[model samples]
Each structure stands twice: as C-alpha cells, then as structure tokens.
Target: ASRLYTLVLVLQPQRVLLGMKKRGFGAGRWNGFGGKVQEGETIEDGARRELQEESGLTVDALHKVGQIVFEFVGEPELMDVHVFCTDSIQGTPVESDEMRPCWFQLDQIPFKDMWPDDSYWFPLLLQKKKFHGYFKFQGQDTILDYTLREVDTV
Candidate 1:
C-alpha cells in the first residue's frame, strides 16, 4: 500500500515560502507545507488545509507541478506525494505548532537543511516543469537511488 500525501510551495517572483517543521515527521528541516490526505477530502483541499494549518496562509489556486514516490527501507509503504505550487496567496505566513514559516530567495534555498531528494527535483520545480520522480532511501539521510524526469503534464 501507498500513503497519499500533499506538498504545496508558495512561490513569489524571487523567492519561495517554506516552513521549518517544528515537530512530527520531517521535523527540523525546511520544506513545503502539507500532510496526509484525509478520507472524503479532495486532494487539493487537503493540500490547502495543511498549508493553512502549518503556515497560516490560504491559496485559492495551485498549480499541480509534480508527483514523487518515496520508498524507505524500513517503511512498509511508499509515500506518494502530490506536489503543488502557487505564486499568489491570501494571508501572511505565520508560525504554527507544526512549522515555523519563512521565505527564502530562490537562489538561497537551503537544500542542506532539507530532505536530500529535494535537490534532485527542486530545479525542475523552479523551472516550472511538470515532473514525476521516485526515490529509494536507506533512511532519512541517504538516497540510495532515484529517478526523475520532466513530463508534459503532472
């Protein structure tokens, strides 16, 4: 079985909004806002809900940018994350119990402080290319292998 997840990034002209997770999975790293998609909730809505919960921001629209499946050596199921991005938002980002929000210049994304696989696909995201990728990891800190490609549509 695979766990469905969502990850949304707020992008502005020269920067991107990211949250430094304060607790739970991915804690201590700067990443986009998202979480598990609940039953009866549309995928987009789930992404929106998680973003608001973690970053105190709401976006009326998002662009479906990619899908990435992550395989962890010790985990029983793959994590299927639907990735979205938006250039416009309705509220200021505020820190929450789950995350501390911040904006980073596009050129200054802290890949060293993020999931290792982010560097592989983030370039594609910044290029505004639709993509699909798979990453196999030995643990949280290592990428044993991966494959990524640009797609006509996500």
Candidate 2:
C-alpha cells in the first residue's frame, strides 16, 4: 500500500493569493497546498507539515475530511489517500520551492489546474461536511468506476 496525504486549506478569499507552478503535473497551473506524508508522522502532522512547507502557513486545527482507495488493474500497489481539512491557520502564505501560494475569491477557484476529483468534494468541505470516496482509474486516462459516501451532519 502507498499512503499519500493532502490538505484542504480554507482561507479568507480576500486574503488569498495565487502562484503558478512551471513544471510537472501542476506545471503552469495553480493548486492548494499539500504533498506526501513523511516517515513516522501521523496523517494530520504530515498534512500540517506539507502545508507549511509548501505555503508557509501553519494550520491551527486539522480535521480528517476523508480517505480514498484507488486500485488500478496492473498497478503494483494500491494508492491510499488521506484528505484533511483545516480552516484554522496562522501566518501569511508565501511561495516555496514546490508551489506558489495565491489567494482567490470563494467563487474564483482555479479549477483547470486541479485534479479532476477536486471539483467533486471540495464544495462539501467548504460546506463543513465530511465525505469519503473511492476511485479506480486506468493509467490516469480511464475512470473505471467510483463511489461517494457522505457523512450526515447532526
């Protein structure tokens, strides 16, 4: 199993800024702050560290928003993704070696550069809802199947 982690950072639209990546999957595109989990760190810790490493901001609280398990036919290992949401944070965001931090209005997210799946659950997080999803793709070109599970709010 391969464990990957990401952080869904919520910032005041007015205070957000944007930066563009010039290479790789996000080359010439914008995205939220996140990266892989470090050895021996919990998912929350990894998310916070990656957020700070990539955006220069510190999260106050990180809530486990969801998890994803992806198994591709012919793939050597399954991909397990842990997603976290954090609205409480401190410090200003700035550019880093891996990303350029930018602020955008609530309705002005740069969707083209983000993963296709982001547009699906991001709205739920913004609404303070928890969700879980599973996706199976074929070499990033085919979405063989998927499922979404949302947690009810009391």
Candidate 3:
C-alpha cells in the first residue's frame, strides 16, 4: 500500500522553523512543518493547512523543493512525500496539538535528533537549491540505502 503526504519547510533568512513532533508517524523527532494530507485535498492546500495548523502561520510563497520516497526495509507501505519550502510566513509561533515549534540557526540545527535523511537534504534546502531524494529505512536513524540530487530550477 502507498500513502501521500506533504512536509513543509519554513525558512527565514538565517534560521528555519522546525517542530518537535510528539505524535503520529514522525513522533519524537525534530522535523520541518507538516504531516498527513487529508482526503480530497490538493497538495498545495494540504501543505498550507499543515503549516498553518502546526506553525501558526500562512505563507505568501511556496516552492516545490523536492519529493522523497520513504520506504521501509521490509514493508510494502511507502510514503510519497512532496516537500515544500517558503520564507514568507506570517504569524507568531505556537505550541500546537501536534508539535512544539522552535527556531534553529542553520549551523546549529540538531541533525542527530532529526530523521536520518534530514541530515542529508536540509543542506540543499539551506543552500537554496531544489532537490529530490529517496531512502529505505529499517529503523529510526538508519538509512539502509538512498540517493539524492540537487536539480536545476526553472
């Protein structure tokens, strides 16, 4: 089986907004802003809704940064994750039902506390490059295999 999801990354000039997910699939990790896409929702709508719901803001701009295929080592379920980025968010950060939002300097981010793949691609995002990635994981922090590329943008 397969499922689709949206994960939004909010970037400011020198920092990024991240959340400590306390529930669901990404629980106990520092992650960018987003989650499950509700039924009947467009990818853009779902990304906006998740960011607004979790980060306490609506963005004026969004860039389709990447698409990640998250697969488990032995399971048939795969997550087709469309990733987005934006710097024009408007609102104060808040503690939501899903996560406790926080800001981190680009050089001070806690990659050890994030998903393994995050350690790889966040740099591309920070570098203002568009990218795509694929990963197969057997457990948290373990990337059995993967591939990534920073691509040209139109």
Candidate 4:
C-alpha cells in the first residue's frame, strides 16, 4: 500500500503532549498530532504542519523516531505512518476543531482510549528509542496481530 501519514509528539520533561481527536479517522481517541500528507509536502513538512495545526505548537526540527505500517483486514491500502518527536514549541495546545489537546505524565498516558498498537510501542517511544511496527487490525480497536521492536534508526 502507498498511503502515507505523519504523527508527531511533543515530549516535555516528564510529560508528553497528546490530542483527543474530535473527528476523523481516530475520532474520540487520544493520539499524536498529525494527518494525511498533502501531495506536494515532504513527509517531514507534512508532519510539522499537522503538529502546528493540531497542537498550536511549532517545531524547528522533528526527530524521526519510528515508523509503522498499519493494515486493516478488509482494506487494500496500508497506512504508512512516519512518527516523530520534539520538545520544541511555540504556542499552547488548544482545542482545535479537530483535536482537544492535553499533556500526560509519562506513567499516566491514556492508552486505554488510544489506538491499540500505541500501547505496544509508546513505552519505547517515551524512552526515546527508535522503533518500527507492523500492525494488522480487525477494525480500529482490535489488533489482530503485530510485530514491534526497537530499532537502531528509523
């Protein structure tokens, strides 16, 4: 599958910024800031724009931390999500039209309301470890199966 997407996270000292998606693909769930990449934007550029849009913060640079290939049982195209993170910022994370943003302590991330695959990799992400995962979901919430591991580089 050739579909592409970007997801970025804001990492603070002991907290990470996350968003409650108000609508769209992951509506009603907690997630990193991002969306589908526009045709002409580089994946990195797409990520930056989304972070700013969803969280009202701007990052001068995004550290590539991981990648994931998400497959749904009945879908033909896979979603390739490029993941990034940064502590940099510009504004506060507000309630955007698409997201209601907030920060969570490292040990208290709201995994129960996020994508199932997230729980498998988020701990590694908080540790600043690079990783990659391939998840096949039965739908949006159930992980039919998956493979996740730390990587030397993303």
TM-score of each: 0.98, 0.79, 0.93, 0.97
TM-score winner, 3 or 4: 4
Per-residue lDDT tens digits for candidate 2, residues 1-154, read 6657565565553433445654554466665666677889977788778787777888778777777677777987776777666555788777788787777787877766665566676677566677887777776545678887787531
- In the predicted model 2, the residue pairs found to clash are 16-103, 17-102, 17-103, 18-102, 18-103
Kindly report which residue stretches of model 2 are placed more than 4 angstroms away from their true locations once superposed: 11-29, 152-154
lDDT of each: 0.95, 0.68, 0.87, 0.91
lDDT for each residue of candidate 3 in 1-154, tens digit (9 for 90 to 100): 7777888988889899999998987799999887778898998799999988887888888889888889887788898888999887888889998989999988999998899899888888888888878899997667989999987751
Off by over 4 Å in 3: none
Model 4 lowest lDDT segment of ten:
87-96
RMSD to the true structure for each prediction, in A, is: 0.6, 3.0, 1.5, 0.9
Compared with the true structure, the alpha-carbon lDDT of candidate 4 equals 0.91
Candidate 2 weakest ten by summed lDDT? 10-19
Which ranges in model 4 have alpha carbons more than 4 Å from their true place?
none
Task: Compose the digit string of candidate 1's lDDT tens values, residues 43-93.
Answer: 899999999999889998988999999999989999999999999999998
Ranked by TM-score, the better of candidates 2 and 3 is 3
